[PDB]
Amino acid sequence: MTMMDMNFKYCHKIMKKHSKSFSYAFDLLPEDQRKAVWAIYAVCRKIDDSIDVYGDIQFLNQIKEDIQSIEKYPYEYHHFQSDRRIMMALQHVAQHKNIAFQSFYNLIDTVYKDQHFTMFETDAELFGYCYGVAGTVGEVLTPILSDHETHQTYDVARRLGESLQLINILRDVGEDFENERIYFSKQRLKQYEVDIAEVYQNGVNNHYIDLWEYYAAIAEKDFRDVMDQIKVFSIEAQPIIELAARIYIEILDEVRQANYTLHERVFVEKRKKAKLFHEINSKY
Ligand SMILES: O=C(O)CC1(CC(=O)N2CCN(C(c3ccccc3)c3ccccc3)CC2)CCCC1
Ligand SMILES: [Mg+2]
């Protein structure tokens, strides 16, 4: 059990803690691929959580500088300014894999922006945000999940990232509203005559359900497009990625069964995840 094992085990802990579903699927990858996934995940999570450490951009700028050190000198010893365990594991991954560093920088830029968040005028802006926060992370994962990356591999991974984000949005409407965030676009809220504050106070209605289902149908079509292009990924990652997906599709059903409540977080029971993987894996 080396120092490097401990760094990876820490990254695992972070991923298990903050996303049971992704944890459940990507943990099924062969050992060197899953460890690379944990490290990427943990870095992205730290970026996502950085503003609330002191309440400003300090820690986020140290994370960015750590990443830039790795990118510029992948083989030098660095005294990392942010979370050393995570940055050592990332550096280890970078020595073995072609990481898209600009995709971490895009992610970090989306975080800086989110300090002065203003609602999206249009869906194009919402989708731009899903790229920023999640398509970027798909791009970063691409060399880990495929043998030979082409632009298609990046395109599928990116679309998978964004459609997972859209599903998070649709699950978390109420919690996000409490945190003063609404991610549905002003254009689409206006068109469907929906006011989130009003829906949070008074319950769902038919306009809200129609708005929600509008975006659910986008996520679902994107998901089918990903599944039809599953073979861009390595054979070992294909059932894993198919499973990660299927579980997020199921989140949409969990929301509908809970009548679109804006007052709790719904989830796919662990035993249900094991059932989806049985279903998938029978066909692998
Ligand atoms: O709970 C929450 O608030 C949100 C959760 C985390 C989450 O949904 N995302 C969406 C993007 N995935 C990417 C990813 C990064 C690293 C490893 C696996 C997956 C990804 C991007 C692209 C392709 C696949 C996967 C990471 C962050 C935690 C609870 C479950 C949903
Ligand atoms: Mg959200």
Coordinates of all heavy atoms in Angstrom, one line a residue, residues 83-127:
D83 N -5.0 20.8 -3.2 CA -5.2 19.5 -2.4 C -4.1 18.6 -3.0 O -4.2 18.1 -4.1 CB -6.6 19.0 -2.7 CG -6.9 17.7 -1.8 OD1 -6.0 16.8 -1.7 OD2 -8.0 17.6 -1.4
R84 N -3.0 18.3 -2.2 CA -1.9 17.6 -2.7 C -2.2 16.2 -3.1 O -1.7 15.7 -4.1 CB -0.8 17.5 -1.6 CG 0.5 16.7 -2.0 CD 1.6 16.4 -0.9 NE 2.9 15.9 -1.4 CZ 3.2 14.7 -1.9 NH1 2.2 13.8 -2.0 NH2 4.4 14.4 -2.4
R85 N -3.0 15.5 -2.3 CA -3.3 14.1 -2.7 C -4.0 14.0 -4.0 O -3.6 13.1 -4.9 CB -4.2 13.5 -1.6 CG -3.5 13.2 -0.2 CD -4.5 12.7 0.8 NE -5.4 13.8 1.3 CZ -6.3 13.6 2.2 NH1 -6.5 12.4 2.7 NH2 -7.0 14.7 2.7
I86 N -4.9 14.9 -4.3 CA -5.6 14.8 -5.6 C -4.7 15.3 -6.7 O -4.7 14.7 -7.8 CB -6.8 15.8 -5.5 CG1 -7.8 15.3 -4.5 CG2 -7.3 16.0 -6.9 CD1 -9.0 16.3 -4.3
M87 N -3.9 16.3 -6.5 CA -3.0 16.7 -7.6 C -1.8 15.7 -7.9 O -1.4 15.6 -9.1 CB -2.4 18.1 -7.2 CG -3.6 19.2 -7.2 SD -4.2 19.2 -8.9 CE -5.6 20.3 -8.7
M88 N -1.4 15.0 -6.9 CA -0.4 13.9 -7.2 C -1.0 12.8 -8.0 O -0.4 12.3 -9.0 CB 0.2 13.3 -5.9 CG 1.1 14.3 -5.1 SD 2.6 14.4 -5.9 CE 3.4 12.8 -5.6
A89 N -2.2 12.4 -7.7 CA -2.9 11.4 -8.5 C -3.2 11.9 -9.9 O -3.0 11.2 -10.9 CB -4.2 11.0 -7.9
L90 N -3.7 13.1 -10.0 CA -3.8 13.7 -11.4 C -2.5 13.7 -12.2 O -2.4 13.3 -13.4 CB -4.4 15.1 -11.4 CG -4.6 15.8 -12.7 CD1 -5.5 15.1 -13.6 CD2 -5.2 17.3 -12.6
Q91 N -1.5 14.2 -11.5 CA -0.2 14.2 -12.2 C 0.2 12.8 -12.7 O 0.8 12.5 -13.7 CB 0.9 14.7 -11.3 CG 2.4 14.7 -12.0 CD 3.4 15.5 -11.2 OE1 4.5 15.8 -11.7 NE2 3.2 15.7 -10.0
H92 N -0.1 11.8 -11.8 CA 0.2 10.4 -12.2 C -0.6 10.0 -13.4 O -0.1 9.4 -14.4 CB -0.2 9.5 -11.0 CG 0.2 8.0 -11.2 ND1 1.5 7.6 -10.8 CD2 -0.4 7.0 -11.8 CE1 1.5 6.3 -11.1 NE2 0.4 5.9 -11.7
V93 N -1.9 10.3 -13.4 CA -2.7 10.0 -14.6 C -2.1 10.7 -15.9 O -2.0 10.1 -16.9 CB -4.2 10.4 -14.4 CG1 -5.0 10.3 -15.7 CG2 -4.7 9.6 -13.2
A94 N -1.7 12.0 -15.7 CA -1.2 12.8 -16.9 C 0.1 12.2 -17.5 O 0.3 12.5 -18.7 CB -0.9 14.3 -16.4
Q95 N 0.9 11.5 -16.7 CA 2.1 10.9 -17.2 C 1.8 9.7 -18.1 O 2.6 9.3 -18.9 CB 3.1 10.5 -16.1 CG 3.5 11.7 -15.2 CD 4.3 11.4 -13.9 OE1 5.0 12.3 -13.4 NE2 4.1 10.2 -13.4
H96 N 0.6 9.1 -18.0 CA 0.2 7.9 -18.7 C -0.8 8.2 -19.8 O -1.0 7.3 -20.6 CB -0.3 6.8 -17.7 CG 0.7 6.4 -16.7 ND1 1.1 7.2 -15.6 CD2 1.4 5.2 -16.6 CE1 2.0 6.5 -14.9 NE2 2.3 5.4 -15.5
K97 N -1.5 9.3 -19.7 CA -2.6 9.6 -20.6 C -2.6 11.1 -21.1 O -2.2 12.0 -20.3 CB -4.0 9.4 -19.9 CG -4.3 8.0 -19.3 CD -4.0 6.8 -20.3 CE -5.2 6.5 -21.1 NZ -5.1 5.1 -21.7
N98 N -3.0 11.3 -22.3 CA -3.1 12.6 -22.9 C -4.4 13.3 -22.4 O -5.5 13.2 -22.9 CB -3.2 12.5 -24.5 CG -3.2 13.9 -25.2 OD1 -2.6 14.9 -24.7 ND2 -3.9 14.0 -26.4
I99 N -4.2 14.1 -21.3 CA -5.3 14.9 -20.7 C -5.6 16.2 -21.5 O -4.6 16.9 -21.8 CB -5.0 15.2 -19.2 CG1 -5.0 14.0 -18.3 CG2 -5.9 16.2 -18.7 CD1 -6.0 12.9 -18.8
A100 N -6.9 16.5 -21.8 CA -7.2 17.7 -22.4 C -7.2 18.8 -21.3 O -8.3 19.1 -20.7 CB -8.6 17.6 -23.1
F101 N -6.1 19.5 -21.1 CA -6.0 20.5 -20.1 C -6.9 21.7 -20.3 O -7.4 22.3 -19.4 CB -4.6 21.0 -19.8 CG -3.7 19.9 -19.2 CD1 -3.0 19.1 -19.9 CD2 -3.7 19.8 -17.8 CE1 -2.2 18.1 -19.3 CE2 -3.0 18.8 -17.2 CZ -2.2 17.9 -17.9
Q102 N -7.1 22.0 -21.6 CA -8.0 23.2 -21.9 C -9.5 22.9 -21.4 O -10.3 23.7 -21.1 CB -8.0 23.6 -23.4 CG -9.0 24.9 -23.7 CD -8.6 26.1 -22.9 OE1 -7.4 26.4 -22.8 NE2 -9.6 26.7 -22.2
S103 N -9.8 21.6 -21.3 CA -11.1 21.3 -20.8 C -11.2 21.5 -19.3 O -12.3 21.9 -18.9 CB -11.5 19.8 -21.2 OG -11.7 19.8 -22.6
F104 N -10.2 21.2 -18.5 CA -10.2 21.7 -17.1 C -10.3 23.2 -17.0 O -11.0 23.8 -16.2 CB -8.9 21.2 -16.4 CG -8.9 19.7 -15.9 CD1 -7.8 18.9 -16.2 CD2 -9.9 19.2 -15.1 CE1 -7.8 17.5 -15.7 CE2 -9.9 17.9 -14.6 CZ -8.8 17.1 -14.9
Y105 N -9.6 23.9 -17.9 CA -9.6 25.4 -17.8 C -11.0 25.9 -18.1 O -11.5 26.9 -17.6 CB -8.5 26.0 -18.7 CG -7.2 25.5 -18.3 CD1 -6.2 25.3 -19.2 CD2 -6.9 25.1 -16.9 CE1 -4.9 24.7 -18.9 CE2 -5.6 24.6 -16.6 CZ -4.7 24.4 -17.6 OH -3.4 23.9 -17.3
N106 N -11.7 25.3 -19.1 CA -13.1 25.7 -19.4 C -14.0 25.5 -18.3 O -14.8 26.3 -18.0 CB -13.6 24.8 -20.6 CG -13.0 25.2 -21.9 OD1 -12.3 26.3 -22.0 ND2 -13.1 24.4 -23.0
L107 N -13.8 24.3 -17.6 CA -14.6 24.0 -16.4 C -14.4 25.1 -15.3 O -15.3 25.6 -14.6 CB -14.3 22.6 -15.9 CG -14.8 22.4 -14.4 CD1 -16.4 22.4 -14.4 CD2 -14.2 21.0 -13.9
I108 N -13.1 25.4 -15.0 CA -12.7 26.4 -14.0 C -13.3 27.8 -14.4 O -13.8 28.5 -13.6 CB -11.2 26.5 -13.9 CG1 -10.7 25.2 -13.2 CG2 -10.8 27.7 -13.2 CD1 -9.1 25.0 -13.2
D109 N -13.3 28.1 -15.7 CA -13.9 29.4 -16.2 C -15.4 29.5 -15.9 O -16.0 30.5 -15.6 CB -13.6 29.7 -17.6 CG -12.2 30.2 -17.9 OD1 -11.5 30.5 -16.8 OD2 -11.7 30.3 -19.0
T110 N -16.1 28.3 -16.1 CA -17.5 28.3 -15.8 C -17.8 28.5 -14.3 O -18.8 29.3 -13.9 CB -18.1 26.9 -16.4 OG1 -17.8 26.9 -17.8 CG2 -19.6 26.8 -16.2
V111 N -17.0 27.9 -13.4 CA -17.0 28.2 -12.0 C -16.8 29.7 -11.6 O -17.5 30.3 -10.8 CB -16.2 27.2 -11.2 CG1 -16.1 27.5 -9.7 CG2 -16.7 25.7 -11.5
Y112 N -15.7 30.3 -12.1 CA -15.5 31.8 -11.9 C -16.8 32.5 -12.2 O -17.2 33.5 -11.5 CB -14.4 32.4 -12.8 CG -13.0 32.1 -12.4 CD1 -12.1 31.6 -13.3 CD2 -12.5 32.3 -11.1 CE1 -10.7 31.4 -13.0 CE2 -11.2 32.0 -10.7 CZ -10.3 31.5 -11.7 OH -8.9 31.2 -11.4
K113 N -17.4 32.2 -13.4 CA -18.6 32.9 -13.9 C -19.8 32.8 -13.0 O -20.7 33.7 -12.9 CB -19.0 32.4 -15.3 CG -18.3 33.0 -16.4 CD -18.7 32.4 -17.7 CE -17.5 32.4 -18.7 NZ -17.6 31.2 -19.7
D114 N -19.9 31.6 -12.3 CA -21.0 31.3 -11.5 C -21.1 32.1 -10.3 O -22.2 32.2 -9.7 CB -21.0 29.8 -11.3 CG -22.3 29.3 -10.8 OD1 -22.6 29.6 -9.6 OD2 -23.1 28.6 -11.5
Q115 N -20.0 32.7 -9.9 CA -20.1 33.8 -8.8 C -21.0 34.9 -9.1 O -21.6 35.5 -8.2 CB -18.7 34.4 -8.6 CG -17.6 33.5 -8.1 CD -16.3 34.3 -8.3 OE1 -15.7 34.1 -9.4 NE2 -16.0 35.1 -7.4
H116 N -21.1 35.4 -10.4 CA -22.0 36.4 -10.8 C -23.1 35.8 -11.8 O -23.2 36.3 -12.9 CB -21.3 37.6 -11.4 CG -19.9 37.4 -11.8 ND1 -19.5 36.9 -13.0 CD2 -18.8 37.5 -11.0 CE1 -18.2 36.8 -13.0 NE2 -17.7 37.1 -11.8
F117 N -23.7 34.8 -11.3 CA -24.7 34.0 -12.1 C -25.8 34.9 -12.4 O -26.3 35.6 -11.5 CB -25.2 32.8 -11.3 CG -26.4 32.0 -12.0 CD1 -26.2 31.0 -12.9 CD2 -27.7 32.4 -11.6 CE1 -27.2 30.4 -13.5 CE2 -28.8 31.7 -12.2 CZ -28.6 30.7 -13.2
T118 N -26.3 34.8 -13.6 CA -27.5 35.5 -14.0 C -28.1 34.4 -14.9 O -27.3 33.6 -15.5 CB -27.3 36.8 -14.9 OG1 -27.0 36.4 -16.2 CG2 -26.1 37.6 -14.3
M119 N -29.4 34.3 -14.8 CA -30.2 33.3 -15.5 C -30.0 33.3 -17.0 O -29.6 34.4 -17.5 CB -31.7 33.5 -15.2 CG -32.0 33.2 -13.8 SD -33.7 33.6 -13.4 CE -34.7 32.5 -14.4
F120 N -30.1 32.2 -17.6 CA -29.9 32.1 -19.0 C -31.1 32.6 -19.8 O -32.2 32.3 -19.5 CB -29.8 30.6 -19.4 CG -28.7 29.9 -18.6 CD1 -28.9 28.7 -17.9 CD2 -27.4 30.4 -18.5 CE1 -27.9 28.1 -17.2 CE2 -26.4 29.8 -17.8 CZ -26.6 28.7 -17.1
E121 N -30.8 33.5 -20.8 CA -31.8 34.1 -21.7 C -32.4 33.0 -22.5 O -33.6 33.0 -22.7 CB -31.2 35.2 -22.6 CG -30.8 36.4 -21.8 CD -32.1 37.1 -21.1 OE1 -33.1 37.1 -21.8 OE2 -32.0 37.6 -20.0
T122 N -31.6 32.1 -23.0 CA -32.0 31.2 -24.0 C -31.5 29.8 -23.6 O -30.5 29.7 -22.9 CB -31.4 31.5 -25.4 OG1 -30.0 31.5 -25.3 CG2 -32.1 32.9 -25.9
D123 N -32.0 28.8 -24.3 CA -31.6 27.4 -24.2 C -30.1 27.3 -24.7 O -29.4 26.5 -24.1 CB -32.5 26.5 -24.9 CG -33.8 26.2 -24.0 OD1 -33.9 26.6 -22.9 OD2 -34.7 25.5 -24.5
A124 N -29.7 28.0 -25.7 CA -28.4 28.0 -26.2 C -27.4 28.3 -25.1 O -26.3 27.7 -25.0 CB -28.1 29.0 -27.4
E125 N -27.7 29.2 -24.2 CA -26.9 29.6 -23.0 C -26.9 28.5 -22.0 O -25.9 28.2 -21.3 CB -27.3 30.9 -22.4 CG -26.8 32.2 -23.1 CD -27.5 33.5 -22.6 OE1 -27.8 33.7 -21.4 OE2 -27.7 34.4 -23.5
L126 N -28.1 27.9 -21.7 CA -28.2 26.8 -20.8 C -27.3 25.6 -21.3 O -26.5 25.1 -20.6 CB -29.6 26.3 -20.7 CG -29.9 24.9 -20.1 CD1 -29.2 24.7 -18.7 CD2 -31.3 24.5 -20.0
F127 N -27.4 25.3 -22.6 CA -26.6 24.2 -23.2 C -25.1 24.5 -23.2 O -24.2 23.7 -22.9 CB -27.1 23.9 -24.6 CG -28.5 23.4 -24.6 CD1 -29.3 23.7 -25.7 CD2 -29.0 22.6 -23.6 CE1 -30.6 23.2 -25.8 CE2 -30.3 22.1 -23.6 CZ -31.2 22.4 -24.8

